[PDB]
Amino acid sequence: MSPILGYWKIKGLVQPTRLLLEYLEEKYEEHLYERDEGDKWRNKKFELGLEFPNLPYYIDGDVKLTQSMAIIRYIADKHNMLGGCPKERAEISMLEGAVLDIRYGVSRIAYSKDFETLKVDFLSKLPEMLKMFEDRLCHKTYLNGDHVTHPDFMLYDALDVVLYMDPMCLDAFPKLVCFKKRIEAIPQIDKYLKSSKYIAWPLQGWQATFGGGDHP
Amino acid sequence: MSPILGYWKIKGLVQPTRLLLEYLEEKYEEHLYERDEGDKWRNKKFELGLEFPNLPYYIDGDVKLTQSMAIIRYIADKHNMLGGCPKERAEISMLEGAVLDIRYGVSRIAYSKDFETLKVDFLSKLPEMLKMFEDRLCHKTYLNGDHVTHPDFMLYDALDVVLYMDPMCLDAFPKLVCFKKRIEAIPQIDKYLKSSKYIAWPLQGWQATFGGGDHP
Numbered sequence: 296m297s298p299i300l301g302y303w304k305i306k307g308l309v310q311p312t313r314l315l316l317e318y319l320e321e322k323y324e325e326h327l328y329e330r331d332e333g334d335k336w337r338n339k340k341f342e343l344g345l346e347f348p349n350l351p352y353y354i355d356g357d358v359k360l361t362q363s364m365a366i367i368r369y370i371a372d373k374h375n376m377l378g379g380c381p382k383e384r385a386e387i388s389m390l391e392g393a394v395l396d397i398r399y400g401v402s403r404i405a406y407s408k409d410f411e412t413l414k415v416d417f418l419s420k421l422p423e424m425l426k427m428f429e430d431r432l433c434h435k436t437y438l439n440g441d442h443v444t445h446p447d448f449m450l451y452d453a454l455d456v457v458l459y460m461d462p463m464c465l466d467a468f469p470k471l472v473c474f475k476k477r478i479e480a481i482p483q484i485d486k487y488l489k490s491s492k493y494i495a496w497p498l499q500g501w502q503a504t505f506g507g508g509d510h511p
Numbered sequence: 512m513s514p515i516l517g518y519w520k521i522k523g524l525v526q527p528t529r530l531l532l533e534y535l536e537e538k539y540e541e542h543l544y545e546r547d548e549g550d551k552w553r554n555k556k557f558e559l560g561l562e563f564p565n566l567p568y569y570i571d572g573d574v575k576l577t578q579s580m581a582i583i584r585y586i587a588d589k590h591n592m593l594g595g596c597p598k599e600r601a602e603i604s605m606l607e608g609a610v611l612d613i614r615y616g617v618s619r620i621a622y623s624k625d626f627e628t629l630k631v632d633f634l635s636k637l638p639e640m641l642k643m644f645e646d647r648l649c650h651k652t653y654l655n656g657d658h659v660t661h662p663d664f665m666l667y668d669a670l671d672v673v674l675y676m677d678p679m680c681l682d683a684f685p686k687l688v689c690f691k692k693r694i695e696a697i698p699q700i701d702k703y704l705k706s707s708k709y710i711a712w713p714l715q716g717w718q719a720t721f722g723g724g725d726h727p
């Protein structure tokens with residue numbers, strides 16, 4: 296049967312994974328927990344056969360997984376996209392980590408009552424983080440070269456998110472601007488982003504001071 | 512020449528990596544930044560050839576890496592320890608993530624002025640996190656079975672850290688208590704923990720409210 300991907304009906308930690316699945320054109324069903332289905336999840340949490348019960352989870356005829364990163368890596372690995380040798384795989388793991396520093400950098404302050412104050416500090420450090428990627432993309436179409444890897448969708452998600460926080464944070468980074476457009480230019484992605492499956496909001500959990508709520 | 516591992520002279524994000532290197536008996540030199548060498552690092556940060564300048568970093572005749580997780584995975588991968596197939600590698604990635612939830616759970620609140628209040632909330636959720644590992648170890652010597660994998664050293668580091676926070680947090684988890692002793696029973700580990708190379712403190716950056724300072 297078709298693999299089952301479970302998570303809240305938000306972008307959050309699973310969006311990059313959804314994009315990788317669409318890009319690979321893999322078939323899959325989603326168990327989406329609405330903002331008021333917290334209890335629905337609780338009563339099912341310890342009943343899915345998961346060794347480390349959590350959201351997101353990925354269940355398919357061969358495995359039962361939790362931990363967003365093990366999930367996206369599993370999907371990529373099943374398609375030989377993790378790297379052909381130790382060095383390459385490390386490059387790709389390094390790219391994941393660097394993207395997470397930005398994505399997690401947002402979530403870390405998005406649930407605070409003093410978001411604006413934290414935001415200033417954050418938007419103050421973001422430029423140096425972005426420049427590392429800008430330089431990475433100066434002589435590359437995608438993060439790992441001519442071919443797409445899962446970090447590309449992670450970066451895309453992170454850029455999508457920081458753009459909501461500051462629509463001008465990419466003004467000094469033309470390569471990153473083109474990269475985001477380039478990802479949206481991928482047929483499978485453009486199709487998915489225009490379909491009824493696409494969850495455009497919220498970015499974080501509904502209760503978040505930033506990227507939360509039921510509407511943009 | 513011998514690989515170079517660089518980081519602050521604290522356990523922090525690199526300790527599990529140091530333990531994996533010792534276990535594998537790999538030769539390596541460390542560029543340790545003292546509490547007052549922040550500037551020493553700044554003036555070298557963008558001069559090491561690192562694509563994503565950060566701490567820790569790992570430089571050896573074949574690669575230049577940053578991102579603690581890409582580093583430990585690289586070392587494990589160079590020894591064929593990441594997993595023999597997609598499923599196994601995902602299991603191992605899942606274990607990393609689950610350990611990080613605990614380790615990062617500590618760092619997230621260790622720099623706050625209200626540590627004690629946050630600590631209560633944290634120590635309230637830790638038991639459910641620990642039990643997942645307790646159950647994982649009920650019919651296994653190590654997290655992935657009979658043989659050691661890098662997540663074992665990550666878990667060890669996390670247990671070492673939560674024990675400083677609460678010396679009794681493992682009282683209901685005998686398998687975890689034995690697991691920690693079992694890791695310390697590994698010849699290379701026992702030797703390293705008794706050598707002059709072992710950095711017992713601090714756990715977090717020196718400025719941390721918890722696990723910080725120059726002395727326990």
Ligand SMILES: N[C@@H](CCC(=O)N[C@@H](CS(=O)(=O)O)C(=O)NCC(=O)O)C(=O)O
Nearest residue numbers: 307308349350351362363364500608612
């Ligand atoms: N490290 C885990 C963290 C997962 C996590 O924090 N999940 C949250 C939701 S969200 O933060 O991703 O929105 C949750 O509610 N998990 C279910 C639970 O805690 O019962 C991962 O990456 O998968």
Ligand SMILES: N[C@@H](CCC(=O)N[C@@H](CS(=O)(=O)O)C(=O)NCC(=O)O)C(=O)O
Nearest residue numbers: 392396523524565566567578579580716
């Ligand atoms: N995701 C990175 C985070 C690294 C990080 O936050 N490094 C801190 C130090 S510590 O938090 O690990 O102690 C640092 O000072 N990096 C150097 C810098 O920011 O210039 C990783 O895992 O390697």
